[PDB]
Amino acid sequence: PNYKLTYFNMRGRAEIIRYIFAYLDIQYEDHRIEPEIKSTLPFGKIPILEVDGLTLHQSLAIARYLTKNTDLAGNTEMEQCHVDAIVDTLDDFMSCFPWAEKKQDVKEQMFNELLTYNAPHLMQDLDTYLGGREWLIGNSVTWADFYWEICSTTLLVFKPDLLDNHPRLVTLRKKVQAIPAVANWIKRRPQTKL
């Protein structure tokens, strides 16, 4: 099928979809914008993915759709549940940040609270969850591992010492970044802050 991804010029919520296309070697149009386009969207939000003239929305709904019946999905139905659960736990936390807050003091207080109080607890929980295992779910890479690497990359921009106590979580990031298709995308993609 013809795939057209529409999002801002940034990694953000589209990047999980971009990793998935890269890994599965699926050609797509990576359409990066830039008030007018917002009025055309089903729920006024991006990313959207057009699939042969059908408009899909919700980054994780799309990500899950693209990984159905592929090696990035969980190998069992319970593994798929763990994959979904880890992704929503990550998405929940990232969604707490006031990305679009215009008041700079309010934004700084909230980012700081989340990074200094909430984030370390989540890192601890993820590290204990991973234990000594190779990937987050099962015996091979899933799109949960991709999403960990994507979210932690952005968190590290704001809190460089985030993973100083979690070398196993750093090792996982590096393993995702070492996957040939992912490594190639990381080196060729537009360099944006977020």
Applying CB under 5 A, the residues found at the interface with Mg ion are: 91
13 labeled binding residue: yes
Helices (H), the chain: 15-23, 59-67, 77-95, 104-113, 119-130, 143-158, 167-178, 180-188
- In the set 38, 103, 133, 174, which binds ligand GSF (CB under 6 A)? 38
- In the set 11, 13, 21, 80, which binds a copy of itself (CB under 8 A)? 80
- Which among 41-49, 146-154, 160-168, 180-188 is the span making contact with ligand GSF, rule CB under 6 A? 41-49
Measured from the CB atom, the residue of 50 and 186 that comes closer to a copy of itself is 50
58 labeled binding residue: yes
- Contact call for residues 67 and 137 (beta carbons, < 8 A): no
| DSSP letter, residue 11 | S
- In the set 26, 29, 33, 42, which binds a copy of itself (CB under 8 A)? 42
175 interacts with a copy of itself by CB under 8 A: no
Determine whether 99 is an active site residue: yes
Q: Taking CB under 6 A as the criterion, which residues in 71-130 touch ligand 0O4?
A: 91, 94-95, 99-100
Distances in Å between the alpha carbon of 96 and those of 14, 65, 72, 118, 137? 17, 25, 27, 10, 24
- Contact call for residues 15 and 186 (beta carbons, < 8 A): no
User: Which contiguous run of DSSP H or E holds residue 30?
Assistant: strand 29-33
- Which among 46-54, 103-111, 150-158, 174-182 is the span making contact with ligand 0O4, rule CB under 6 A? 150-158
List residues bridging with 48 in a β-sheet.
6, 57
121 interacts with a copy of itself by CB under 8 A: yes
Work out the number of other CB atoms within 10 angstroms of the CB of residue 96: 14
- Sequence ranges of the binding site: 7, 13, 44-46, 58-59
Q: Which residues bind ligand GSF (CB under 6 A)?
A: 8, 12-13, 38, 44-47, 58-60, 88, 92, 99
